[PDB]
Scaffold this motif. Structure first.
Motif, PDB file in Angstrom:
ATOM      1  N   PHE B 134       1.006  -1.456   0.063  1.00 15.75           N
ATOM      2  CA  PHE B 134       0.268   0.217  -0.196  1.00 15.75           C
ATOM      3  C   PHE B 134       0.909   1.374  -0.129  1.00 15.75           C
ATOM      4  O   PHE B 134       0.723   2.345   0.242  1.00 15.75           O
ATOM      5  N   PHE B 135       2.385   1.054  -0.057  1.00 20.75           N
ATOM      6  CA  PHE B 135       3.033   2.350  -0.343  1.00 20.75           C
ATOM      7  C   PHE B 135       3.507   1.679  -1.914  1.00 20.75           C
ATOM      8  O   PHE B 135       3.548   0.609  -2.701  1.00 20.75           O
ATOM      9  N   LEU B 183       0.655  21.699   1.346  1.00 24.28           N
ATOM     10  CA  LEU B 183      -0.779  21.309   1.045  1.00 24.28           C
ATOM     11  C   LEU B 183      -1.347  21.453  -0.244  1.00 24.28           C
ATOM     12  O   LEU B 183      -2.498  20.810  -0.822  1.00 24.28           O
ATOM     13  N   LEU B 186      -1.122  18.783  -2.379  1.00 26.76           N
ATOM     14  CA  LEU B 186      -2.765  17.376  -2.023  1.00 26.76           C
ATOM     15  C   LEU B 186      -4.223  18.134  -2.667  1.00 26.76           C
ATOM     16  O   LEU B 186      -4.973  18.006  -3.090  1.00 26.76           O
ATOM     17  N   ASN B 187      -4.155  19.706  -2.067  1.00 26.10           N
ATOM     18  CA  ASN B 187      -5.384  19.826  -2.209  1.00 26.10           C
ATOM     19  C   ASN B 187      -5.652  20.819  -3.893  1.00 26.10           C
ATOM     20  O   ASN B 187      -6.592  20.396  -4.388  1.00 26.10           O
ATOM     21  N   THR B 195       0.908  10.498  -1.960  1.00 25.05           N
ATOM     22  CA  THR B 195       0.348  11.937  -1.242  1.00 25.05           C
ATOM     23  C   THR B 195       1.064  10.873  -0.006  1.00 25.05           C
ATOM     24  O   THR B 195       0.859  12.206   0.896  1.00 25.05           O
ATOM     25  N   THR B 196       1.019  10.189   0.631  1.00 28.17           N
ATOM     26  CA  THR B 196       1.663   9.607   2.010  1.00 28.17           C
ATOM     27  C   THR B 196       2.929  10.052   2.249  1.00 28.17           C
ATOM     28  O   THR B 196       3.323  10.077   2.518  1.00 28.17           O
ATOM     29  N   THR B 199       3.273  13.974   3.051  1.00 29.99           N
ATOM     30  CA  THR B 199       2.441  13.769   4.156  1.00 29.99           C
ATOM     31  C   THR B 199       3.886  13.321   5.166  1.00 29.99           C
ATOM     32  O   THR B 199       4.286  14.551   6.305  1.00 29.99           O
ATOM     33  N   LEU B 200       4.810  12.685   4.983  1.00 33.20           N
ATOM     34  CA  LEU B 200       5.702  12.357   5.891  1.00 33.20           C
ATOM     35  C   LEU B 200       7.099  13.241   5.130  1.00 33.20           C
ATOM     36  O   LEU B 200       6.956  13.864   6.480  1.00 33.20           O
ATOM     37  N   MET B 202       6.047  16.262   5.197  1.00 36.28           N
ATOM     38  CA  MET B 202       5.250  17.210   5.633  1.00 36.28           C
ATOM     39  C   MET B 202       5.552  17.725   7.074  1.00 36.28           C
ATOM     40  O   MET B 202       5.790  18.395   7.645  1.00 36.28           O
TER      41      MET B 202
ATOM     42  N   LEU C 183      -9.230  16.313   3.114  1.00 36.27           N
ATOM     43  CA  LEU C 183      -8.543  17.305   2.948  1.00 36.27           C
ATOM     44  C   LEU C 183      -9.022  18.139   4.140  1.00 36.27           C
ATOM     45  O   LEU C 183      -8.292  19.637   4.625  1.00 36.27           O
ATOM     46  N   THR C 195      -1.586  12.428  10.039  1.00 33.92           N
ATOM     47  CA  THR C 195      -1.454  12.830   8.519  1.00 33.92           C
ATOM     48  C   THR C 195      -1.100  12.267   8.209  1.00 33.92           C
ATOM     49  O   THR C 195      -1.776  11.771   6.440  1.00 33.92           O
ATOM     50  N   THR C 196      -0.141  11.112   7.715  1.00 33.86           N
ATOM     51  CA  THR C 196      -0.311   9.751   6.829  1.00 33.86           C
ATOM     52  C   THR C 196      -0.873   8.781   7.202  1.00 33.86           C
ATOM     53  O   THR C 196      -1.641   8.077   5.823  1.00 33.86           O
ATOM     54  N   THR C 199      -3.523  10.327   4.628  1.00 36.22           N
ATOM     55  CA  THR C 199      -3.550   9.869   3.978  1.00 36.22           C
ATOM     56  C   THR C 199      -3.646   8.655   2.616  1.00 36.22           C
ATOM     57  O   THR C 199      -4.057   8.369   1.706  1.00 36.22           O
TER      58      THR C 199
END
Ligand SMILES: Nc1ncnc2c1ncn2[C@@H]1O[C@H](COP(=O)(O)OP(=O)(O)O)[C@@H](O)[C@H]1O
Ligand SMILES: Nc1ncnc2c1ncn2[C@@H]1O[C@H](COP(=O)(O)OP(=O)(O)O)[C@@H](O)[C@H]1O
Ligand SMILES: Nc1ncnc2c1ncn2[C@@H]1O[C@H](COP(=O)(O)OP(=O)(O)O)[C@@H](O)[C@H]1O
Ligand SMILES: Nc1ncnc2c1ncn2[C@@H]1O[C@H](COP(=O)(O)OP(=O)(O)O)[C@@H](O)[C@H]1O
Ligand SMILES: Nc1ncnc2c1ncn2[C@@H]1O[C@H](COP(=O)(O)OP(=O)(O)O)[C@@H](O)[C@H]1O
Ligand SMILES: Nc1ncnc2c1ncn2[C@@H]1O[C@H](COP(=O)(O)OP(=O)(O)O)[C@@H](O)[C@H]1O
Ligand SMILES: O=c1ccn([C@@H]2O[C@H](COP(=O)(O)OP(=O)(O)O)[C@@H](O)[C@H]2O)c(=O)[nH]1
Ligand SMILES: O=c1ccn([C@@H]2O[C@H](COP(=O)(O)OP(=O)(O)O)[C@@H](O)[C@H]2O)c(=O)[nH]1
Ligand SMILES: O=c1ccn([C@@H]2O[C@H](COP(=O)(O)OP(=O)(O)O)[C@@H](O)[C@H]2O)c(=O)[nH]1
Ligand SMILES: O=c1ccn([C@@H]2O[C@H](COP(=O)(O)OP(=O)(O)O)[C@@H](O)[C@H]2O)c(=O)[nH]1
Ligand SMILES: O=c1ccn([C@@H]2O[C@H](COP(=O)(O)OP(=O)(O)O)[C@@H](O)[C@H]2O)c(=O)[nH]1
Ligand SMILES: O=c1ccn([C@@H]2O[C@H](COP(=O)(O)OP(=O)(O)O)[C@@H](O)[C@H]2O)c(=O)[nH]1
Ligand SMILES: [Mg+2]
Ligand SMILES: [Mg+2]
Ligand SMILES: [Mg+2]
Ligand SMILES: [Mg+2]
Lengths: 233, 233, 233, 233, 233, 233
Positions: B134-135, B183, B186-187, B195-196, B199-200, B202, C183, C195-196, C199
């Motif tokens: 799932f990565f 962000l 993502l947005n 996206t994972t 965020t990591l 981030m 989001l 947050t990970t 997502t």
């Protein structure tokens, strides 16, 4: 039935129609051949190659044969997993054991576990060859046949229906043999399978049948006692 | 030098010029780029993908996504081993660590063996992703960057030179960004990476540069402090 | 029953009433809640944290975050083993799988052993997070939900009954949300979970319910189809 | 120096001032005592307990002693990692080996590796006890002393400075011994350490010194030949 | 020096003068012969058999050959450990790698580690055969020779100084060969070594020299370029 | 039945009539005695020694005791595999668990798996001792008894029918005891078993019965409630 337990050796090329990769339709076709054998009631262990994914150190730069062989063993495990899923799609109970221990992915090779699987009427697919470089899966087929007590190694060889006096795709004058001794194979320098797999079967008196698995009835015929392909004994 | 230690994320596609397989000349060309970055004196960890060998469950029959992911992880280890031989061909000291433990083939991922190797000016190639389905290797690249204390993730993206307003391969009118926030990625729903993985990085304030590794000088440029590609921060 | 298979994420704090340690009566009370959910017939996987035993690198001297994370993972396995004994006390069949392989202590995480256990109506408790630093058990809960095919992640959060506009423990004026988008959680910078982890569930369309496990009937309510807590989707 | 190589057994309680947990200031103090010994030039192996984190099956519900012991062994590894970081903060070279194999976290216990570490003037911290339930780390101290060829086991016992005719914290009339035979310890039923650790040292003729490690000079004194604490021989 | 790196295959019988067991003076005598060859500067890898400790399935009751072979693999490791100690007591740097992974006892077989050991002028003793039943120590000698890039396999045969037309301890009229081809060995049905070991060397063009290690000067002779024993090539 | 679950400690010598080796008829005779006890319905766990195959460091050259003990642990596994085959050939369901992990050969020691095996009315044979040097098979018998919840340790002593005031094969005037305390054994300096095994049983209150297994009916007698041999309690 002539045979109660067999080792079926499969080329990785059987998982594709186009030379390279893993393809769903080819994998299903191969699964359907295996299920035809399974439905006879024979106990079925399989060794799967990787020619569809990896040829060898010709593909590397500065690449040892040992390293190239390890890459190839990982490829056989990729095929093993794909083949298991196709067989599970037909509802054939299937287990995979790998000669390289990769816990999250599949059971490690464990003899007593393989035997219990076969006794419980499951197909066992062996991935990873023997775990040693300098073999092909031909030798893994002979080794795993001896380890599970198979009565014969069925070599489903890519693009031939038996053993020939010469490579039949390099010499159209080649003639097919009905029968051969292990030593005849070595003395004539035939290149149909690892000479190490030959001598391993020689030492145990384990017969080998080389045949075309996509000839309808061939695999079931061997299991049921018919004369099919070439017998090495 | 702007950066002392970087994580370089490579597509498995960089090992072929024909869509599929591992090819000597493509692997060698990739090794030469990596050698140029290594010759700057930067400390260099690499994460390698598997798209040249495996495209996911579309290729299987009745195949879980998790199972397809484990097959991809095996494929990344094949690529890691090929890339290591290519770099060693050029005299670059190189180690391979794998997220799945395969003793004969490579050493396992062990955090301060990896730290010691980088300190000893060896390239460490991480195969197997994170070892979790799932990565993508995108998230493995973010994870391994944090684990080795890399200062930036260099995302060598196949066939693009930065992040665009849209897939430039579907939208010829797409526009490249010089800079984005996590962000903003993502947005705007951009599909450049997990996206994972976004965020990591981030959560850690770890910057990402998306760039074209086959634009001559780009990689070495980024290491030396030039503005190349798209910075996500 | 609305859900057939759920992943239940538990704080390590639920095993104590005094901030620190593992305590029999708190563990037993947690086991009784889990038994109420189990008695509905839902299939139940659990991920357990370690905050009752370990709070991170603030407790070490010169300690990496990665090292603090590995210590926390060890602590989650201690909690998993204590929770398993408590559930077995109540007659609930329970298995423990750990992301770090510790043969004597528990079985390793193996995806279709976990699938088989759930099919056999056993609770599977996952210890050790994902086995990777730089996650919380929040992300391990998302990952393990995807791996076992759970239909929702039930986030039992310590001392809150949903997601709020702000930390309700710092902001008495905070307001609870009935529903949020993935989001919306990221853009409002809420600190309810990784947050990970957000997502990962977002990429899969996997819903999350944040709720108070010690509000009687809440857990069983959610399983039966009631509106409890905050839904993230 | 009286001793060239010693095994120092430490209570997990030494890592806290407040009964429970791992605390930075206490861990530093303990590191400073160990460094005082290291600076003499003695070769130093350590076994660390876990009383600061885990007492036993009194804390579980329906908990076997074996399970409680496994939890305790995981706790000793938590302490081992914390102690290593504190010692590394002083620049003392330190390795950790665990009796439970947890590859990502620390080296497994391997005798020839432990010996090379000691010969290279590194402290080796042994976590996990012996790996077997039904021992305390007292017995792990005796076992690891024999395995590395230590000349004496230094038992740094919590809150006492020697062996007493009775538990000195239950009987203020208790008297300290200068010397004892192994059998005297058993015959009098003294509870200062595992009787199994006593007999293990008995069988090898390995002397034991029970002492107060926080009495300034005590540990260095033992190493340098002074009479300190109680000698069991 | 004719050879820079060799693989020396030794029988388990060389560790005893009384047919069975491990005996100190025979082991020491064997180590002195090995040290003489080491002192030439050749890089030296060893494969050790088990015949002094285990003959096979006729010693068992209802014992299949696979199980007997695993028992012999354990015995080869017992011998490897004893040989390593004798060699170390002569000051020869020695490492043991085993085909079956037993962490506490010796390092696992890892090709890159074995290469580094030989390059650092250490003897590598390979125990466990290949890890596969039905493979012999002769086959393990051939395999490990290939894997470490040895230039020749030196088969130290028990009580024989070369290959003969017949078993010499069965036919006093048998005649020794100076030279044979791989195929001549197979066609004449000679029993000097496993036919599988012959064919593996045949496929690689790896020469084999069968000789008597306890003929003083013979091992060193082969290394320096003399004609000793029988050459299979 | 006085006992429902027992641990039977057996010497390696019982597998030979000629002092050394593994012999089929002695192994079969030993299996018939074990089957007689199994046929009472008692749950039966076994610990097996190595004396028929390995005496210790006097057989080595420059061999430390730890290395000798690892060699003996390997030998105990050799015996366990042979005993399992004899028992299986009598139709007794048998499992082997080894203290050293050797996947290909037997399952690892895992307490919960061993408990399930006993509950499914299988004999569990424990090989490898405890995995630790300086621990004896007597200590392993005590430990494994504790771990599986056996009610008594049955020490089948070689050529002796109980505990005596002196070594009986050294003092024909020695007198047998019907009963002793743990401390009496230690104070009298009796050499019937490892003193570390005595104290471990002492701490648990686990009774030991020393008896002659080849006195017909004695093993079954102890199981059914008769007074046989010497009771240590
Ligand atoms: N004497 C022979 N008889 C049959 N096939 C031969 C012979 N010599 C060489 N071959 C080649 O062996 C091939 C099978 O080997 P390979 O390509 O590795 O197939 P597989 O992958 O099934 O082993 C055949 O396609 C054939 O070209
Ligand atoms: N906003 C975007 N900007 C750039 N590339 C994008 C974007 N969205 C999608 N892509 C696509 O993502 C591809 C990179 O994905 P992938 O094939 O996984 O590359 P890699 O293998 O290097 O991770 C690009 O070739 C591009 O087609
Ligand atoms: N927006 C929010 N809504 C609810 N809780 C929040 C929010 N932001 C922060 N929190 C805090 O997060 C805590 C949960 O974090 P943690 O202690 O890790 O719980 P758990 O251990 O269950 O994951 C809550 O007790 C609350 O104090
Ligand atoms: N005869 C004795 N002499 C000294 N200490 C004793 C004796 N009997 C019992 N003890 C207790 O043993 C304790 C040390 O054991 P424990 O609490 O486990 O410390 P550690 O964790 O260092 O082993 C001492 O604090 C003391 O209370
Ligand atoms: N043609 C032959 N030439 C030499 N030796 C032979 C031949 N045929 C059989 N042997 C026997 O093989 C033996 C060598 O094998 P073995 O006893 O197993 O030694 P090792 O244990 O080193 O392999 C010799 O002692 C010899 O008696
Ligand atoms: N006091 C004693 N009572 C009984 N046996 C004793 C005593 N002291 C020494 N022994 C010796 O211990 C031996 C049992 O140990 P051992 O030979 O190692 O058997 P096992 O291998 O089953 O432990 C007996 O054969 C006996 O000669
Ligand atoms: O015991 C084995 C089995 C396989 N391999 C390697 O893995 C590949 C597996 O492909 P194979 O040739 O067996 O497949 P096929 O040609 O039947 O598709 C081999 O070629 C080797 O490179 C190996 O080294 N040892
Ligand atoms: O942490 C990871 C890394 C990889 N993978 C799997 O392995 C594949 C590797 O291919 P990737 O897309 O990373 O390669 P690239 O597209 O960069 O060539 C992924 O697609 C996944 O299937 C995974 O599951 N987890
Ligand atoms: O995938 C994971 C899971 C856990 N952890 C570590 O283990 C701890 C477990 O405590 P957690 O915060 O998950 O517990 P809770 O707060 O829910 O009690 C985390 O904080 C991390 O340090 C980690 O690194 N990765
Ligand atoms: O070989 C060992 C070592 C430890 N333990 C367990 O782990 C704990 C470690 O704590 P210990 O009592 O040794 O620490 P201390 O009291 O010195 O702090 C023990 O109490 C046992 O529960 C065990 O079972 N076996
Ligand atoms: O790869 C290998 C090597 C050895 N063995 C087993 O271990 C024994 C090793 O002793 P061997 O008789 O081969 O050695 P010798 O002392 O005769 O040289 C063999 O007989 C087999 O039973 C095995 O199964 N696989
Ligand atoms: O926990 C254990 C058990 C056994 N051993 C070693 O293996 C041998 C087992 O044979 P033993 O003489 O104990 O058995 P017997 O046949 O005499 O009962 C011991 O002597 C030790 O060398 C060990 O080191 N640890
Ligand atoms: Mg082939
Ligand atoms: Mg790609
Ligand atoms: Mg918390
Ligand atoms: Mg203690």
């Amino acid at each position: 039935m002539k045979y109660k337990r067999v080792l079926l050796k499969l080329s990785g090329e059987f998982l594709t129609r186009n030379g390279f990769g893993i393809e769903p339709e080819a994998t299903q076709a191969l699964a359907r051949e295996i299920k035809a054998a399974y439905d006879t009631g024979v106990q079925l262990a399989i060794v799967i190659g990787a020619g569809n994914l990896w040829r060898g150190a010709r593909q590397g730069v500065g690449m040892d044969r040992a390293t190239a062989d390890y890459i190839g063993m990982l490829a056989t495990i990729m095929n093993a997993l794909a083949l298991q899923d196709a067989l599970e799609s037909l509802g054939v109970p299937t287990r995979v054991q790998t000669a390289l221990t990769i816990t999250q992915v599949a059971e490690p090779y464990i003899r007593r576990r393989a035997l219990r699987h076969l006794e419980k009427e499951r197909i066992v697919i062996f991935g990873g060859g023997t775990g040693n470089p300098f073999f092909s899966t031909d030798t893994a087929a002979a080794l795993r046949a001896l380890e599970v007590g198979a009565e014969v190694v069925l070599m489903a060889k890519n693009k031939v229906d038996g053993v020939y006096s010469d490579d039949p795709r390099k010499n159209p004058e080649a003639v097919r043999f009905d029968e051969l001794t292990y030593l005849e194979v070595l003395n004539r320098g035939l290149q149909v399978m690892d000479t190490t797999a030959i001598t391993l079967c020689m030492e145990a008196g384990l017969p080998i049948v080389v045949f075309d698995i996509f000839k309808p009835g061939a695999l079931v015929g061997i299991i049921q006692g018919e004369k099919v392909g070439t017998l090495i004994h």
